[PDB]
Amino acid sequence: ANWRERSDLTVTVGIGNMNKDQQMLHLMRIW
Amino acid sequence: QADAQRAQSDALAKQAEAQMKQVEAQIRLAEIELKK
Fold first, then answer.
1. Most Cβ neighbours (<10 Å): which of A19, B9, B18, B19?
2. What is the 3-state secondary structure (H, E, C) of chain B?
């Protein structure tokens, strides 16, 4: 839900998100 | 989707080290040194 909602409804990564979106890989791509 | 997000992070919003294209390259080098 975080990647599919937070950056979908408001695609404003930087104002409304952070670089930790790459850390999503560390929780999804890594595992 | 995580790889897509990582690629967006590496491609988009990755111009921070260049000061967002150096703020239009110092605003066109002070508008061509404000003289011609």
1. B9
2. CHHHHHHHHHHCCCHHHHHHHHHHHHHHHHHHHCCC
Whether B5 and A14 lie within 8 Å, measured CB to CB: no
Contact B6, A29 (CB under 8 A): yes
Sign of the Cα torsion B17, B21, B27, B31 reads positive
What's the one-letter identity of residue B22? Q
Method: cryo-EM
Q: Which residues of B touch A28 (CB under 8 A)?
A: 1-2
